[PDB]
Symmetry: D2
Subunit: 257 residues, 4 copies
């Protein structure tokens, strides 16, 4: 397997619809040793779900908390000597930030929270996982969406936060590359997951993507997963600071009839 032996932490596994789940499947298939995090309440949900991947640890981490992030690495450090990759696959903004008119809906706090959890958290993982990742061709991969590059209806404050996320990825790539750590992002097409169920007309966004995309289909979690897997391998050691669109070609078209 092209991740044989590599020790990789996956955040954001929540259901078997989660992009994290596709990432997990793809890495397990490639011989990685996996560890997972969960937010307070979902301890049991998550342990059950990822038991099939034979996890070396399953640990709490609510990225709102500097402490928990700190502890994540202390505990993980008891199990592993180094860390080969961190997969950041978490996002959040309050419900009210995410439909209707951007300017009517945006609030100071809701803007703040979305950035805190969806963007700052990536640098915070990087900050705390740094020393475990020094000098072993390590990797980080964040999950992002095209609403970072373009104004879309509904995505709103998450679009602005994903923008922050992508800038963070690049500043992080620059800051960690002296330690040999590569840092990249995968910009997924829309996928029906738990996060998606907040959005009332999601099936239509999906249909529009499949219609307008060059490949005339929707992406699935394995396509994304496999891509994240690859970006955590020795094969990608020439790639950093990069956004790879895994979106059936959506990003490259304009005006699909």
């Amino acid at each position: 397997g092209f991740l044989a032996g590599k020790k990789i932490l996956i955040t954001g596994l929540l259901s078997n619809k989660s992009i994290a789940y596709g990432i997990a499947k793809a890495m397990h298939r490639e011989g990685a040793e996996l560890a997972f995090t969960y937010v307070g309440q979902f301890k049991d949900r998550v342990e059950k779900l990822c038991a099939e991947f034979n996890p070396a640890a399953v640990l709490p981490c609510d990225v709102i908390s500097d402490q928990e992030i700190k502890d994540l690495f202390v505990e993980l450090g008891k199990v592993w000597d180094g860390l080969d990759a961190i997969v950041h696959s978490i996002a959040f903004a309050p419900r009210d930030q995410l439909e209707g008119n951007f300017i009517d809906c945006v609030t100071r706090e809701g803007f703040s929270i979305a950035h805190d959890i969806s963007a700052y958290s990536f640098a915070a993982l990087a900050k705390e996982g740094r020393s475990m990742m020094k000098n072993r061709n390590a990797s980080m991969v964040a999950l992002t969406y095209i609403g970072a590059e373009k104004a879309m209806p509904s995505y709103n404050t998450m679009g602005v936060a994903k923008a922050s996320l992508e800038a963070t990825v690049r500043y992080t790539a620059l800051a960690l590359g002296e330690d040999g750590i590569k840092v990249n992002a995968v910009s997924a097409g829309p996928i029906k997951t738990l996060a998606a169920s907040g959005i009332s007309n999601f099936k239509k966004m999906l249909d529009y993507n499949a219609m307008v995309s060059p490949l005339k289909k929707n992406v699935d979690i394995m396509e994304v997963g496999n891509t994240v897997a690859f970006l955590c391998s020795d094969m990608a050691t020439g790639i950093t600071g990069e956004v790879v669109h895994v979106d059936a070609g959506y990003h490259c078209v304009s005006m699909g009839n």
Copy 2:
């Protein structure tokens, strides 16, 4: 003048080096009626400074505060019936966020403050100014920097914030366009202003820019000012969501002939 009659609010005037000063010079020249904001302490500084532009109003506005922003438009609405443009020319991040290695230096609270003041504040001005700006070919312009697009040494957290500012500009363009309001940013090349005095090797950044840029020079506040003024005119009514680099061509090269 091509801004004659237009009622424009300018934020971020702080010294005669400020980009906002260049913006003010250019708009006054072009016949705009001007109003300025200041942050608490600097009331006297700013009134003295912008007196030469015969301002219709010089009002407090610390964009940390939702209230003050709200009152800004209340007070301004007493003086003016509509508003034609808002020029956003404010940034801030804590000193610690701005040199050395990004990951060593970045903190949760510093990330937060940088975004709050540098990025969210744009949408907040839009949110509160919106009604005064309805259906008169109104305009918004934010100042940005190429550290939004690329990782640069030092810029760090401000880079991330600037990326957020630029997204905000686009989402605001989409949200306000039905009211005929155009929303854009100017991306200035580096210029020696008060904000620049925080950065310890700035003269060298300036010198590098001038060497590497196709135009072999550094931009000044009039080049920026004039561009901002343009983007607030009836001549730019086809332009929105856009970032216009005013940087002597810096953005379009890589690796000059001197390595």
Copy 3:
């Protein structure tokens, strides 16, 4: 006027719908002295059309020909001492390159021709105008389209050539800036012009743009021309190698 005194050559004026016409209107309004070029056949058409701008010269220039380009500058140099700006507003690709599936339709010669006229020509005006333009804060502006950045239906080979154009604008900015010449491009939203009449469903592209754009309207030749004018002014001396979208915000949205 903010172009008062400036001596500017405008290419591509063909009808009063032409983007060049909007550019001409705007620069005349701003006090520029104008000169125009035309392709062989349209001499009378064009002379009539631009007479209202009181042109210093109206001269043939088919950018397929290196010699005609050369002679354009010889003749112009007999009228003016220096040249303040060149406005490039010309494109062309054979009809067959421009609808249906890109791969079906693209041909070696059609690819070639589209790039020759649509892109190479920009550097060729630069090459030959350069010495008239040295050290007077001169300018060049090309017209481009978002079909350069994204794959669109129909635009095909012209999109590829637009992308080549845009690069030629950047390499030109880099090559000419030591002489103080600024080089930029204005990326226009779609406008119903003679070039547009080649495209069978154009009214629908227009309607889509107006629907999907943040400003909910179509741009016109005055919005484009005003921007071209500005990019030829002393006000814009900090700007080069830039693409300015004049498209009612279309470039910045996705899925609307």
Copy 4:
């Protein structure tokens, strides 16, 4: 192997330094069946070189000629039923297009030849290979360089041609995606190959890349190769019209040489 069974055509193999060599190494290691093209004179060179990959075919194809391109697929179709991938790794401009001031050096013919060979040829392979590639998750990958996006010294006419190649890639992706064919590009950092030996100060460009990149190193042919390999696998079926930078992060920084 993640390309086991896949039938892939590789253009541009010229020496064991070629980027095509690294791509070939990678894909053979992943179980691909390989075929190679060469330009007239280099038949023996290339047969010797790629013998270690056990090629199903080694065929002439000068992309100046529509006939040779056509015949490449006729011959290849005698050996294989379908084709899984085409790797386009070929560029050329005449010597005189490639150093000095862009505008002094660009010529009508040189511009033409650069685009014909470096850009049009990709769509030409697509055109003729399309029928062998229908409905099997097939792939195309072109090699490109950041000189397409930015103006750089020396690259000149090739930069404009690369810009054209990247648009061709996007329009090809949109035109072939109804047949399930994905089409992408890899934007390599500079690598010392035969094409590089035309450029007189190449070692310095390399050294500058390494200094300014986040990863503080030069990419090699395997890094590029492996990425190309991946873009031709089933794992990459959600990726098209993309440019992947395999350049040790060069593309995302600015002013990395200012201390």
